[PDB]
């Protein structure tokens, strides 16, 4: 008992190596001595508390070995103490072995540290699996201990980390079963607060002084709000009885978040919009027009063309497939023609122009042609000639910033590309270009088509040879 | 390793080679802490050579390093 106490107290010291020693000592006592089952049953609560404290108290900018050690030891302990578990042992009496442990683990689901929440949910799932039960069955009695404190205070006044933890806890709770969290007034007020937070600007959120960590906090808060609103959108009771523009507002906020500069926000909004589009199967005209207006606004002038706007167009094309129209590619080609100046191109040579902004804009323009609808098969000659002329002006062979998007677009219509190339077998440029394309590691579709139609290739070549010309 | 060093210490070729080398090294930066001494020594030496090249010609190579720091 004294040795166990020493190991458990080692976990609470402020030196990290002492914490690691404590966790390792607990592991050694668990998996190398076999002091018996009653002993572990009497030490389990202290062991769990000490390991969870080690997870809580480690600074997050040091190496992660100590936290991993604590988590592994916790996994082993939980595996040991649930050897012959049963549903009667985990739930409170109508004393149960694991009810106190379940309550203690539930109490840490809203912590301000994300690793703590991850560990707690992992442990709860591990316990539930061993008892052939559902998580909601175990967590129903202790739901108030989490829900009550969160609904007490206004969410706007709290620091960032506390808000993130609270929102994550509610989001996890409202996924266990369809009626776990009722749609009462408290939940509606919380959801409206989340919508307001997601729709706000960085300056309004305590100001963005360009500091790294404030920006990180704001991004994380936005991601959490987006996720909770997306989960709420899956319920038919949300926004229905209101009959007000709640769901349209959520969709507008999603679209606004899709056009942001932060990648995590873009990914979260992309997932939310994908789910909404899959579920709805239909879209009101006005809402989609409002969502599309900003994208079409920025594609009208070649002087203000940017990589960001073209990325937004690409994301929108990926989301709404059968909604766009042809004749935007022609406008993009005209913009490319305008941007590429013979004197500018002459000057650009002699330099490593991979870092030029105009070249990046042109590459972004070319990157859109493999996302356009199927009818974009009529631009193959135009784009191939454009790229070849651009490379000729820059005195480049085998390599340029424009090869990757062109290859991506060409690998989608192998039949058309092969027919076009075989129609021009008496020119060295086109054969050389197709051979160069085939040698890229990612041109497997074209390689398969060519391996299938070697017969037609040889037939056309033999026809040309038998014709008896100088070419 | 003398070849990158020779290219980086010449006024004519230093900027373009520095750009190419930095672009290549940014894809490998994750191998620095590999615990294999042979793997990490070479990457560290290449990074140091690029930085020394930046120091040698400040009026030209600063803009090459700017988008990576």
SS (H, E, C) chain A: CHHHHHHHHHCCCCCHHHHHHHHHHHHHHHHCCCCCHHHHHHHHHHHHHHHHHHHHHCCCCCCCHHHHHHHHHHHHHHHHHCCCCCHHHHCCCCCCCCHHHHHHHHCCCCCCCHHHHHHHHHHHHHHHHHCCCCHHHHHCCCHHHHHHHHHHCCHHHCCHHHHHHHHHHHHHHCCCCCCCCCCCHHHHHHHHHHHHHHHCCCCCCCCCCCCHHHHHHHHHHHHHHHHHHHHHHCCCCCCCCCCCCCHHHHHHHHHHHHCCCCHHHHHHHHHHHHHHHHHHCCCCHHHHHHHHHHHHHCCCCCCCCCHHHHHHHHHHHHHCCCCCCCCHHHHHHHHHHHHCCHHHHHHHCCCCHHHCHHHHHHHHHHCCCCCCCHHHHHHHHHHHHHHHHHHHHHCCCCCCCCHHHHHHHHCCCHHHHHHHHHCCCCCHHHHHHHHHHHCCCCCHHHHHHHHHCHHHHHHHHHHHHHHCCCC
| Best to test chain A binding among B8, B13, B18, B19 (most A CBs inside 10 Å) | B19
| Best to test chain B binding among A351, A353, A355 (most B CBs inside 10 Å) | A355
Partner B contacted by A352 (CB < 8 A): yes
Phi then psi for A146, rounded to 5 degrees?
-95, -45
- Residue B66 DSSP one-character state: G
- Chain A CB contacts of B15 below 8 Å: 352
Chain B nearest C-alpha distance from A462 (Å)? 44
Pairwise CB contact (< 8 Å): A355 & B67 = yes
- Could you tell me if B56 and B14 are in contact, meaning their C-beta atoms sit under 8 angstroms apart? yes
Partner B contacted by A357 (CB < 8 A): no
Distance CA B23, CA B11 (A): 20
Enumerate residues 14 to 33 of chain B having a beta carbon within 8 A of any beta carbon in chain A. Answer: 15-16, 19-20, 23
Pairwise CB contact (< 8 Å): A355 & B20 = no
- Could you tell me if A373 and A321 are in contact, meaning their C-beta atoms sit under 8 angstroms apart? yes
Pairwise CB contact (< 8 Å): B23 & A351 = no
- Chain A CB contacts of B16 below 8 Å: 351-352
| Rounded (10°) CA dihedral A362, A364, A366, A372 | -140
Distance CA B33, CA B41 (A): 10
- Give the chain B residue nearest A353 (alpha carbons): B16
Resolution (A): 2.6
Pairwise CB contact (< 8 Å): A352 & B20 = yes
């Amino acid at each position: 008992s004294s040795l166990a106490s020493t190991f458990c107290h080692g976990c609470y010291e402020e030196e990290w190596f002492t914490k690691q020693g404590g966790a390792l000592g607990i592991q050694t006592l668990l998996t190398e001595i076999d002091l018996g089952d009653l002993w572990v049953a009497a030490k389990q609560i202290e062991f769990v508390r000490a390991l969870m404290y080690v997870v809580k108290d480690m600074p997050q900018d040091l190496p992660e070995k100590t936290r991993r050690t604590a988590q592994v030891t916790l996994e082993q302990l939980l595996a040991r103490i649930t050897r012959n578990a049963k549903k009667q042992d985990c739930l409170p009496p109508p004393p149960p072995r694991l009810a106190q442990l379940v309550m203690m683990l539930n109490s840490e689901l809203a912590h301000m540290n994300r690793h703590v929440r991850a560990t707690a949910r992992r442990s709860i799932e591990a316990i539930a699996a061993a008892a052939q039960a559902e998580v909601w069955e175990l967590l129903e009695p202790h739901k108030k201990h989490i829900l009550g404190p969160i609904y007490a205070k206004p969410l706007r006044a709290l620091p960032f980390a506390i808000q993130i933890g609270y929102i994550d806890a509610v989001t996890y709770y409202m996924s266990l079963k369809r009626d776990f969290v009722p749609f009462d007034e408290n939940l509606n007020r919380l959801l409206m607060e989340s919508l307001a937070l997601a729709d706000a600007s960085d300056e309004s959120l305590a100001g963005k002084t360009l500091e790294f960590r404030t920006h990180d906090f704001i991004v994380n808060l936005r991601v959490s709000c987006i996720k909770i609103l997306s989960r709420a959108m899956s319920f038919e009771e949300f926004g229905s009885g209101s009959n007000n523009p709640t769901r349209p507002k959520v969709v507008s906020v999603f679209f606004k978040c899709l056009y942001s500069d932060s990648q995590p926000t873009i990914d979260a909004a992309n997932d939310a919009l994908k789910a909404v589009l899959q579920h709805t199967t239909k879209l009101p005209k006005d809402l989609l027009q409002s969502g599309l207006r900003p994208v079409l606004a920025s594609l009208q002038d070649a002087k203000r063309l940017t990589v960001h706007s073209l990325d937004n167009l690409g994301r929108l094309l990926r989301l709404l497939t059968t909604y766009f129209k042809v004749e935007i590619g022609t406008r993009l080609l005209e913009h490319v023609k305008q941007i590429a100046d013979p004197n500018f191109l002459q000057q650009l040579s002699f330099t490593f122009f991979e870092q030029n902004n105009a070249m990046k804009v042109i590459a972004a323009v070319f990157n859109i042609f493999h996302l356009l609808p199927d009818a974009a098969r009529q631009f193959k000659e135009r784009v191939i000639d454009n790229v070849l002329d651009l490379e000729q002006k820059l005195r480049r062979t085998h390599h340029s910033p424009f090869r990757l998007p062109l290859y991506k677009y060409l690998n989608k219509y192998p039949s058309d590309i092969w027919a076009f190339t075989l129609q021009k077998l008496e020119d060295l440029r086109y054969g050389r270009f197709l051979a160069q394309v085939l040698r890229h590691p990612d041109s497997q579709v074209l390689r398969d088509y060519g391996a299938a139609n070697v017969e037609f290739i040889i037939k056309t070549c033999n026809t040309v040879v038998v014709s008896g010309k100088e070419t | 390793l003398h070849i990158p060093q020779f290219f980086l210490a010449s006024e004519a070729t230093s900027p373009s080679f520095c750009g190419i080398l930095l672009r290549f090294l940014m894809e490998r930066i994750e191998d620095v802490g590999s615990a294999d001494i042979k793997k990490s020594s070479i990457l560290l030496r290449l990074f140091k050579l690029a930085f020394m090249a930046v120091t040698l010609f400040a009026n030209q190579n600063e803009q090459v390093l700017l988008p990576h720091v």
